[PDB]
Each structure stands twice: as structure tokens, then as C-alpha cells.
Amino acid sequence: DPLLARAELALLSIVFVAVALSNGLVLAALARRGRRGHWAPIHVFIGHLCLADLAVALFQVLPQLAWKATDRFRGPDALCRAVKYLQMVGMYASSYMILAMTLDRHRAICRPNRPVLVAWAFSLLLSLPQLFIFAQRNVEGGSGVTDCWACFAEPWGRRTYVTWIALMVFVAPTLGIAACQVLIFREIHAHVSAAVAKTVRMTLVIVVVYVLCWAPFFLVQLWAAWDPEAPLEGAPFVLLMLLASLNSCTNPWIYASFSSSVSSELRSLL
């Protein structure tokens, strides 16, 4: 439990760090005092991304406090349905965000209605299957005492109905961003005076930090359950989910860190 208590404190740390980033929401979206639209601005989707990710900490504070505070397996009004639905919805939202960032990143360069919102809410089309796979059937612990636990009624037979989607939401930006590499590298012949080699390496930098902080996500999907279901618990497993939310943490840092918002840090910390 003392180790469990320290783990819980580390869990609480994610909200502090993520919202110490979420200040970036106001910081950037109020640091662009012109060209007000919906497909006109520059930091369009990092602003949107901060908006979305802050909800992860918002809706992550509540569950792991609620289960620690008291038993809530059966009895409450959709507390085994609604709060968990909103939780994983807010979390998986973070998936296609960086993806759509990248999508129009390479499309607006030399490729030809709204790219933001359909991509944004496509998560919900899997969230409804999230509710179906979280059908909240309970498993007996002892003497007829059960807990609302992830159901096996959907996973049985084929359990990978969301794992491969996680695989693709992970891997997607790689080919497009390397295509950006190819395009820009052919653009250069012999901002730009000091950051063309640096911009290709920064392409790599954003890529590698993304894949690094999302490596814990793939360690969630794999090597956690050697058998198809019922993953085996482990001691180092504790930091895995921590880093998983540290994705959404560092993501505001990793974007607002150098492009349009070093000026924002100057205007905020003064």
C-alpha cells in the first residue's frame, strides 16, 4: 500500500503536469491576435489538442479517487458505465489528434470538407464499441461479491477488435512524415537559413519523442498479456500508464516548445 500510495501520488502528478501545459491552451490561442477563423490559423490543432487532452486529466482525477474512497462495483447510476466511457473517450481522443495534425501537415504542402472534426469525433465511433466491450458484467471475487470489470463477452473469439486500431493510430504519422522528409529534402538544393538540416532532424525529433512516449502504449498492448486476454500483473507495469498519460502531457510541450510559442512563454512568464 505505501508503494500503492506513492503510485497514486504519481498518478495525481499527471494532472499537475498536463495542466501546467494546458496553460498553453490559453497562452497560444490568445497569442495569435489576428486571422480568426477555423481553417486559417497556424497552431490550429495544437490549440484543439490542448483543449482535448486537458480533459484526460480532468476525467482521470475522478475514477481512481472514487474507487479508493469506497466500493462502487454495483449500485451507482452508471458509475461503472458513464465515467469510464467518458474516461476512455477522452483518452483515445488523443490518438487521431497528432495524426490529423500530420495529415494536413503533409497535405497542405503539395497536395490539394473539414479535416478536423470528423477526425476528432471518429473516436466516438469506436467509443460505442468501447461501451459494448465494457458491458460492465461483473466477476465474483468471493462469497458472491462481484466487481464491475472489463467484459469478456465481446473479447472472446477475437480479442483484437481495438488493439490493431491502437496499432494504426500509433504508426500512422511515420510514412507521411518521412514523405515530408523526402519532399523538403528535394526542395533544398544547395527558419530556413539555420534550420533546414535542423528542420529535417526536428522532423525526426518530434517523430522520436512521439514514438518514445507512445512506446509505453505498445507495451500496454503487447508483452502485458502473453495469453490473448487477462494480462499478467507486474511491478514495472505501474509507470507504463503514467508514461501513457505523459504522452498527452509532453505533447503540448513538444509542439508549443519552439515554433509559435517561445514568444508565448516570453509573454506568460514575463
Binding site: 500503492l4 481512481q64 476512455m88 483518452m91 472489463a150 500496454v220 500483473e233 500508464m241 501513457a244
Partner: peptide
């Protein structure tokens, strides 16, 4: 506790 695992009692 993201996909399915939470501390024991």
C-alpha cells in the same frame, strides 16, 4: 487503469 488493470484490495 487505462484498458483493464487496477490495484488490488
Amino acid at each position: 487503469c487505462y484498458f483493464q488493470n487496477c490495484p488490488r484490495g
